[PDB]
Amino acid sequence: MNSEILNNIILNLRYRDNNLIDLSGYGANVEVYDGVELNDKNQFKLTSSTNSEIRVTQNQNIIFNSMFLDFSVSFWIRIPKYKNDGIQNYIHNEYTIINCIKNNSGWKISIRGNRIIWTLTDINGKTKSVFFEYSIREDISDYINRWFFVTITNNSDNAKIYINGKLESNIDIKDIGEVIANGEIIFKLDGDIDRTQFIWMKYFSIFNTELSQSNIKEIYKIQSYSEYLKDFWGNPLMYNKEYYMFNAGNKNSYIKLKKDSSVGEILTRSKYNQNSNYINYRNLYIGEKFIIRRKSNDDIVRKEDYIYLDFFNSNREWRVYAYKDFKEEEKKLFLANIYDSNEFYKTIQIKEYDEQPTYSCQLLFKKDEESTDEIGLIGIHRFYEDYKNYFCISKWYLKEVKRKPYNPNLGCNWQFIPKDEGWIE
């Protein structure tokens, strides 16, 4: 990790012993109230409950306001989807999530529907705001209810917002005077919110430098790294959990067992079809309900694990298999009940070929016996009937995944979508 990053951390809020602590080395006081849900993946949840609050008292014995002339804030956030019957309140109602104010001066992070807002107030009461807005009209959003990485950088001249390491917003703040930035930091939802409103956050940090684009991309990569695969939302991928399947190479496509058949046909997602012309999305809770089974201390799926890919068909667990008789470059997968056959492969190795941050994984068929032989990767392909798109195994992907840079648009890139309280359709 670049010393430009490490040498300049003045607040580093991290999970420790069923608590959040400052690990910067400056010793800020952190009070987590009983309404904050914490987990050992460093995620914390702010709710509408009066006791859902974190109070951080910066160490004013060591931390001087002059340190915040150039400064940056980074965190990950997961902001739930609008309620389809609540779109007006979503669009209009601004709520604070993090507030650092002394005598009406300081900095604030707030949300209004689909925008995240950075506000600076100087000691004269002169305010300037910069914001990031993500679309609520995309077929498939990178942002709605999914973990993403925010970095805000400030110097005398500019306030910038980066999202997943890329610049999204930039305002001139030359006219903004002295900002008191060393006060108490309050993590708490504050505004005209529904009872059901919540925000997830992770890895909240403050740096007493203006982080470079280079520095921000490095933090994004380091904080993205895991030994475990992730789901579509960015949470750890789990065994024994029901998941819809998403194809990162054909985002509007889903798998359905073809009626009375043993193959998965690829169909096009339905779309939001109610009144509001403010919103558009493709349905996520569609197609077969899959479940990942261990082939042989936690239920987390790790890179290189051996798995069965199963799904529920008419009240019974079925399995995804690949025919051993496989002369062509691609072949439809065989969907059937759970049984052993010398005629098919059942064992999948779950892979991450991508070097760059991603929630996609890849699914490699192997022989039952612990062998280095690679059969093929699960993907999509058009087969002669006109041509029709099917759930397939492909030898073609074996060479494509070895190409640099890794192509995230390959049809062998899958994500697993569990039902989530932050996504109601």
Ligand SMILES: CC(=O)N[C@H]1[C@H](O[C@@H]2[C@H](O[C@]3(C(=O)O)C[C@H](O)[C@@H](NC(C)=O)[C@H]([C@H](O)[C@H](O)CO)O3)[C@@H](O)[C@H](O[C@H]3[C@H](O)[C@@H](O)[C@H](O)O[C@@H]3CO)O[C@@H]2CO)O[C@H](CO)[C@H](O)[C@@H]1O[C@@H]1O[C@H](CO)[C@H](O)[C@H](O[C@]2(C(=O)O)C[C@H](O)[C@@H](NC(C)=O)[C@H]([C@H](O)[C@H](O)CO)O2)[C@H]1O
């Ligand atoms: C386009 C095509 O049909 N590709 C299939 C390929 O067909 C061979 C010839 O195609 C090329 C090619 O890949 O483009 C032509 C190049 O010139 C070749 N390059 C060389 C030699 O350097 C290249 C290579 O030879 C091979 O790739 C091997 O490495 O092949 C194609 O032109 C030719 O077409 C014939 C046709 O078959 C005949 O019917 C017709 O009469 O004549 C034409 C012209 O001759 O056929 C060639 C083989 O006979 O063959 C490979 C198998 O080797 C694949 O089938 C390939 O198609 C790809 O298959 C995989 C599954 O294995 C997927 O289905 C790919 O689709 C996806 C995916 O990755 O899953 C779907 C995704 O939705 C999509 N993402 C998007 C749109 O966001 C991705 C994405 O487009 C690509 O991954 C690239 O980013 O594709 C499917 O493309």
